[PDB]
Amino acid sequence: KFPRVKNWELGSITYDTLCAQSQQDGPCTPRRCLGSLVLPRPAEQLLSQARDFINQYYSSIKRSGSQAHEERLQEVEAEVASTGTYHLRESELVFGAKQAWRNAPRCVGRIQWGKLQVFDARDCSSAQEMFTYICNHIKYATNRGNLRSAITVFPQRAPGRGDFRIWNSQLVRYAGYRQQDGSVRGDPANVEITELCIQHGWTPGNGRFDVLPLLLQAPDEAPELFVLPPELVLEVPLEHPTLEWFAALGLRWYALPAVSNMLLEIGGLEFSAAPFSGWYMSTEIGTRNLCDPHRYNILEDVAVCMDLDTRTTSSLWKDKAAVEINLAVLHSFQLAKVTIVDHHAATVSFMKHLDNEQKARGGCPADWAWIVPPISGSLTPVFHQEMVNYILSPAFRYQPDPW
Amino acid sequence: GPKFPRVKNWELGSITYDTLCAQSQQDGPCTPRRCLGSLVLPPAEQLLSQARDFINQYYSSIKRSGSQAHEERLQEVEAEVASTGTYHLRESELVFGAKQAWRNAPRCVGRIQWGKLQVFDARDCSSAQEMFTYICNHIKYATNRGNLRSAITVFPQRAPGRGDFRIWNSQLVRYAGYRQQDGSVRGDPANVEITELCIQHGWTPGNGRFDVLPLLLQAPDEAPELFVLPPELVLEVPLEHPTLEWFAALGLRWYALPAVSNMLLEIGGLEFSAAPFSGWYMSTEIGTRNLCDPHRYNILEDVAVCMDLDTRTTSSLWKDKAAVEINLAVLHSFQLAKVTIVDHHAATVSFMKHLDNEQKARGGCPADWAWIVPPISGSLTPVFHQEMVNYILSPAFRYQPDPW
């Protein structure tokens, strides 16, 4: 019933009891673990999810059973009974957004969960308005390199009406230009979105790091195209501390990781456009974004600059180049005074988070395969920590691409 | 479409479906409410069903499913359980079973090799001395002076009302772990308990960082007896670095042969409590886990200081740098000594090929992602980007409680 969770570096044993609060099914069954899969394969429903959330909210401020609690439950019940739905008070929304981050099993950065600026953009009626909110989000979150976590929340979904959607997966993304000679200039993860932009009338560039426009969509309307003011988008040229040739690669990355394709669910209400940003862990850029084969794929180029043996795997040329690239990202962001965390500091902070959550709730939902970094796994403490994975609401969820 | 798990490779974009998982009879630790996949250790009627199942598997493998000999073997096994409460496997059944157990092992990245496994039948063994002889032969055969060969030696099965054959050590080769009076550990901390068990049983202990442990061997209903391995049987590789000349002076070494000996081999409900097996190392096992784990030899800081790295800050990536050079030293020295080894890139590539083989051969392959992905350079290898389905097929290797 209650899972025995062991740390194999220290011998420590905990027991997760938070998992009992899980109301949603994951992809595993006793016959097969599907834990490594990236994506997933009436009115009393909503009402019970609403009651549960309001109950959480009032417990958070230590006022359970009180008359403000009991009254808020009836407001929620009266509205659902008459309209099939209801609305969150802003304070509740602020709470809900923090819990969704706190509950995100794949996020290594949750030590920060209580510090989150929440912009209420539920009074949005057009793509143009959505653009203003996004520009402001970016300005606030970027704060000249002293990054600050933020989320902007657009109107929730409503029955028989199209969704508010940001078509881009992140607020800032580099273009992917498919050359007709088989290759791709720019970021191959972004080929499809780049093509959507062009079809919607964007005039494309031809660099490896062309910042994409935002395609914003208000309900049942064609998406509209907005170019982000170049001064809003802070970027960091990459250079290496000892390899003077590194900067000559023209490599660079943007400061702000702002995810915009996820759906935020609070108390049974769904928010299809709710972009959020924190700051980068260095490996995201250094390992995944630049070294992944289906991305910028720079491993070989850097290895040759380093004059390593490329002819054989046993010279570990890949491992060596990757370390230097990650070092270039850390150095450069620190040089440009932009908030960034290395994977050792991050994982160490995540262990402290686990301990805080253990005392606070009796567990912490965590997805080992995502929490463990993409290089130097067992060299971080999270590797040796067993983790229980489950779904708590409020939550961030994936949703289909709107096209 | 298909009512089976869909499996994606995110590098290549390719999709497969796992139908093999339908063959699983034993439940794992996960439920719809929570995934426990990262957890390291989570009657004649029952026997007969497992026995019938394995006999069906065996006859399938030789393409005689539904045949007269198949049905006679079924009747033969049932009648044997009917009078003894257990049954016995034929030689070729044991060979097929042992190989299928390796094939079925979700955590093993080396399964491309699964059909080339030398199976030594040792079901005649009747003493601890004789266990020693068999073990020595295994080591000689498998070590083959550096040109390593996969092998398993299978000792008599669990019998009703008779003690188990057990090998107390977790591997046939392991370094002593000597607990110091100043709290620390000399040698391998992983092996503190078995070292103390060896001493309690009469072994005169050394005081090195790399003292090879004696074997504690247990024949049925008898106390374990102690056997020292003749040193020439135990191939070691001194560690040096291709370009960093000082690395040799660290005096580090590792043994050639990884030979796991505490696992239980299960076949058709028959349980072989002693069935040590061995292949060859993947370099990250030695270079990353055994030598760099904090709770193992923990040499990361030593090496980083020799490399003159800034160890006062995480963001210098000193751990990452030292780790790479240690791994490189493992590879270089094993190659120089001409002792079979595989780096984590070559291994993971070979595992992708294996997944493709098994997709065609069996409609899928049970695989534990957290264990298949290597402990350094994870996403630099192709398996990181490969979704995997994990489940228990039988025949299997299983963990078993320690004899004491």
Ligand code: HEM
């Ligand atoms: C403040 C610093 C933060 C750091 C260092 C951090 C770190 C990370 C990293 C490394 C990942 C893995 C992402 C990947 O490989 O694609 C991740 C995932 C995630 N993060 Fe954070 N994060 C931070 C802030 C936030 C904030 C403010 C939110 C939302 C309020 C958030 C929500 C999430 C979610 C929902 C995931 C999982 C995405 C998925 O399931 O695909 N994070 N985080």
Ligand code: HEM
């Ligand atoms: C031939 C070369 C082989 C290589 C390179 C190889 C590689 C590996 C590696 C790296 C692991 C991870 C273990 C750990 O980190 O603790 C592993 C696990 C495992 N291997 Fe293989 N292996 C090989 C041969 C074999 C053979 C011959 C057998 C048995 C007949 C076998 C059975 C297993 C089993 C049962 C595990 C899982 C152990 C556990 O679950 O705790 N392997 N292998």
Ligand SMILES: CNCc1cc(OCc2ccc3ccc(N)nc3c2)ccc1Cl
């Ligand atoms: C799961 N496939 C990639 C994917 C990642 C997503 O999130 C990545 C993500 C999410 C939140 C983050 C927060 C901070 C940070 N530095 N990186 C972060 C990275 C969202 C949608 C998709 Cl489709």
Ligand SMILES: CNCc1cc(OCc2ccc3ccc(N)nc3c2)ccc1Cl
């Ligand atoms: C659970 N981790 C410790 C443990 C590891 C075990 O096996 C590790 C193992 C098993 C087989 C291997 C075969 C080849 C190889 N290179 N390494 C191999 C490593 C068995 C039991 C235990 Cl208790």
Ligand SMILES: C[C@H](O)[C@H](O)[C@H]1CNc2nc(N)[nH]c(=O)c2N1
């Ligand atoms: C197949 C595998 O589950 C997939 O590639 C995962 C593994 N772990 C990850 N971990 C993080 N942080 N981000 C990712 O995109 C992934 N991808």
Ligand SMILES: C[C@H](O)[C@H](O)[C@H]1CNc2nc(N)[nH]c(=O)c2N1
């Ligand atoms: C807690 C976690 O499951 C544990 O550290 C695992 C992770 N993956 C592993 N992978 C391999 N190959 N060997 C191991 O011992 C482990 N340990």
Ligand SMILES: [Zn+2]
């Ligand atoms: Zn699972």
